[PDB]
Amino acid sequence: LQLFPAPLLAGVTATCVALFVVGIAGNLLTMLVVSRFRELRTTTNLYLSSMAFSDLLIFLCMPLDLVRLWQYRPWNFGDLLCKLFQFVSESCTYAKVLTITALSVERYFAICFPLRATKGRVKLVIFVIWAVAFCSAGPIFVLVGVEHTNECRPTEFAVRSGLLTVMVWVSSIFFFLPVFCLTVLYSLIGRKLWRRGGTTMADLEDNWETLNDNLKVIEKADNAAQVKDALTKMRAAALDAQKATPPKLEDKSPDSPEMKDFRHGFDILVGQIDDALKLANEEAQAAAEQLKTTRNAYIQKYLDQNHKQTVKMLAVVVFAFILCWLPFHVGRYLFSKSFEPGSLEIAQISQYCNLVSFVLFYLSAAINPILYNIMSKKYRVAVFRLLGF
Amino acid sequence: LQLFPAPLLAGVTATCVALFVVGIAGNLLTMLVVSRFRELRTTTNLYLSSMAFSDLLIFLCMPLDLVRLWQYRPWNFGDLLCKLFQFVSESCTYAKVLTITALSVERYFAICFPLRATKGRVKLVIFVIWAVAFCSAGPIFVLVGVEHWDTNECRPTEFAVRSGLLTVMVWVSSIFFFLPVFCLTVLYSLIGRKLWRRRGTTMADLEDNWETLNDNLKVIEKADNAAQVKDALTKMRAAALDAQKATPPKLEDKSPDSPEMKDFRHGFDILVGQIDDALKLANEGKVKEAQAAAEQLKTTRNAYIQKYLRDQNHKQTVKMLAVVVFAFILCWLPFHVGRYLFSKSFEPGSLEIAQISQYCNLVSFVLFYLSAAINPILYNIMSKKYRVAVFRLLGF
Ligand SMILES: Cc1cc(-c2ccc3c(c2)CC[C@H]3N2CC3(CCN(C(=O)Cc4cn5cc(C)sc5n4)CC3)C2)ncn1
Ligand SMILES: Cc1cc(-c2ccc3c(c2)CC[C@H]3N2CC3(CCN(C(=O)Cc4cn5cc(C)sc5n4)CC3)C2)ncn1
Ligand SMILES: CCCCCCCC/C=C/CCCCCCCC(=O)OC[C@H](O)CO
Ligand SMILES: CCCCCCCC/C=C/CCCCCCCC(=O)OC[C@H](O)CO
Ligand SMILES: CCCCCCCC/C=C\CCCCCCCC(=O)OC[C@H](O)CO
């Protein structure tokens, strides 16, 4: 009994085809980047790659969604399709949710408890996630169907035995998990990142990242008569970088490495900067190269440094996930509260809500690589360098 | 090695997955539609269904083809995978050309030699087509391989190049390419020239009128209204006059004052009269009586006119086939032109050559899968009966 004009459906379908193409392309790019370069295979990235895979699966779901969208009369075998593919879609959703959770959890202990002490661990957790998600979505196979509107919805057997309400429990738990991750875990992350002794943990990262970028840019690019300003920035950043407290110290050491690390790093920065300043007024590039090796010889010795961009990008990611998934849940609750009353206009509202949930579903499947491209510079360079050497 | 951005290659890959979905769906639908709708089981439709098969077969190759495009060696039998699947692809391509040619030929004979002349025949012709294709693509199997700068495929081996077999296969490929060109250029242009040859109207016009008569006859089978049945009948009557003037194909080599044109031209005189009487029943609120009259129209039409004319849809058919064959040639053109230009070009191994060649191969790749997926689209755009049958099976 659908009330969507042909122009509206055509626009939805074209948008969805667009999302199909862009999302396949981008999630493929993400998975390839992770599998290609060794340094990018951090725990967080492996989880993201898992999610990229779930997104690809969702895109394979899309064609039958579009078919069902345009059908006036569903197929005889359609019931099975419904069951199977609803299961598929929701399995993926659950898996992605859990991956986010795992991810967030395993970043959380990575910052708030730096002191806590593996390969195959990540594979095991991914496998655990997929099995748990399959089991949690299992019931869908036996609770939704197509009965004598006329759509892939929960059957009456599901309604009149309570099983619908336990599946809504499961769905709501799964919805609140990423909300918990963004609101509670990411906020505790951000606390520890922006907590005071001379400066904060995030300011360490920015300063350290500012000093290296200036030196590395000039060492291999942007040749000019005077790069002393970059040398000045390096000195200032190195100066502030001493005021911070690296993670291995645990900020419980007033002077035992506070004297060791401050003296050693500041000394290497100091003397090299003074010699670089003299050559800058008048071999300067070689002095910068020599300064670099001491940094690697000391920075690697007592230090991830991407803790801030990682958390901020994960925040945007989890936010977009929850946004796209919110209208479904909200509409479901508000329309469950009024079932029989006013079944005329509320039906129109419900179909439009389901349509926006549809488009949002596939948008969520496509959006993460776009975010990565806009926010991660490392991601950009890795897609640039993907087919090289 | 790869001389274009990864985002381009990922986007091409996704586009190809889209063509995979659409092409599997469309060609499946073509085969189903022909197999179930019996008033769509023509000779040429059976040939098109054969083609739909070859296209499905092509789309199964696309997963491994994309793996090879990304230069992933997941296995060590790549060499074998190449000899096999390249063979597969060429065979399928050859099959289409031959089946195109086959149906073109038949359709040509049907129209230009109308005075001249079963379901086992088409089955045998398709069998023979597939045999000739498999043999003709056979040598691909033994002279392509994967063995030891700026290139990256499965490609002709040195044994192929330096024994002359590669040139023989380029000849074979070029002949196959030109067969559909011959079909479109020669056969279809002669067909259209006879189809639109004046004698009051043209043969193509008579087919439009016949087709409007048969369609409006189907309307009265289910019409419920005076104006509904009367509308159909009004359109028929204009059609019947304007078709009475035509010169039937079985009687093309006759005189305008023949005993056969009398019976033809008088047969429409009756058929107009029957329409007039069914109209006068419709005017007076006799809907079920006008439909009974309209059935006499069928039997009158059946006796006089079917004997004076087999297929009554040549014009629409050949327009569609021209679009199909043109699309085929266009998609296969860059491969052939590029191969020739790069053989003639004085310089191999240059980077600009390498980049040009890689881009040409990429667009040819996409074109190959586009040619495999586009036919059901064209049928849906052009044939209405086919589009309706597809929508019925899809539930639209
Ligand atoms: C021809 C036919 C097809 C089907 C059929 C029925 C259902 C579904 C599918 C096919 C594919 C996948 C599944 N389709 C996923 C889908 C539509 C969009 N969906 C929403 O809108 C709700 C939602 C979940 N979710 C998760 C996020 C993260 S964001 C977000 N929104 C989710 C369910 C339904 N049956 C009978 N015959
Ligand atoms: C993992 C692996 C895979 C393979 C392998 C090698 C080759 C091919 C395939 C797999 C699949 C099919 C075959 N692939 C078809 C193909 C690519 C696209 N091709 C073109 O672009 C040229 C063309 C023909 N043609 C006909 C038209 C009509 S339009 C048009 N274009 C045709 C050849 C090659 N080997 C080694 N390890
Ligand atoms: C919002 C950003 C837009 C960027 C990219 C937007 C377009 C992407 C794909 C277009 C091809 C899809 C083909 C059209 C898909 C729906 C077709 C349809 O439903 O019927 C229309 C038909 O053409 C009536 O004759
Ligand atoms: C060695 C290098 C040689 C390279 C040579 C490349 C030439 C390709 C040019 C083709 C344009 C010719 C236009 C032909 C248009 C025919 C369209 C057609 O017949 O189909 C339409 C259909 O019939 C509608 O009713
Ligand atoms: C070439 C034919 C292949 C068909 C399978 C393609 C695979 C993708 C499936 C669905 C895309 C969305 C369906 C596009 C909607 C087209 C239907 C349409 O626009 O026709 C209106 C009709 O009256 C309905 O009410």
Author numbering:
A (entry chain B): 35 to 151, 156 to 186, 195 to 242, 1001 to 1086, 1091 to 1111, 255 to 340
B (entry chain A): 35 to 151, 156 to 186, 193 to 243, 1002 to 1111, 254 to 340
Manuscript excerpt for this entry:
The ghrelin receptor exerts a wide range of physiological functions, including appetite regulation, alcohol consumption, adipocyte metabolism, and glucose homeostasis, due to its broad distribution and multiple signaling pathways through divergent G-protein coupling or β-arrestin recruitment.
To describe the molecular mechanism of the ghrelin receptor in binding with PF-05190457, the initial construct of the ghrelin receptor was truncated by eliminating the first N-terminal 34 amino acid residues and the C-terminus after residue 342. To facilitate crystallization, a thermostabilized apocytochrome bRIL was fused to the third intracellular loop (ICL3). In the resolved crystal structure, the PF-05190457-bound ghrelin receptor is packed in a P21 monoclinic lattice with two complex molecules per asymmetric unit. Whereas PF-05190457 adopts an extended conformation, the arm-1 ((6-methylpyrimidin-4-yl)-2,3-dihydro-1 H-inden-1-yl moiety) of the ligand projects into the cleft between TM2 and TM3 and is covered by ECL1 and ECL2 regions, making van der Waals contacts and hydrophobic interactions with R1022.63, Q1203.29, and F1193.28 as well as disulfide-bound C1163.25 and C198ECL2. The diazaspiro core (2,7-diazaspiro nonan-7-yl moiety) of PF-05190457 is adopted in cavity I, forming direct interactions with D992.60 and S3087.38 by hydrogen bonding. Notably, the side chain of W2766.48 rotates nearly 180° and tilts ~3 Å toward the extracellular end, and together with the side chain of F2796.51, it also displays upward movement, therefore pushing out the extracellular end of TM6 and enlarging the ligand-binding pocket, subsequently impeding the formation of a salt bridge by dragging R2836.55 away from E1243.33. Through structural comparison with ghrelin-bound, the PF-05190457-bound complex structure shows breaking of the salt bridge between R2836.55 and E1243.33, breaking of the weak polar interaction between R1022.63 and Q1203.29, and newly established polar interactions between the inverse agonist and residues S3087.38 and D992.60. In addition, the binding of the antagonist occupies the orthosteric site and maintains the conformation of the E-R motif and WFF cluster.
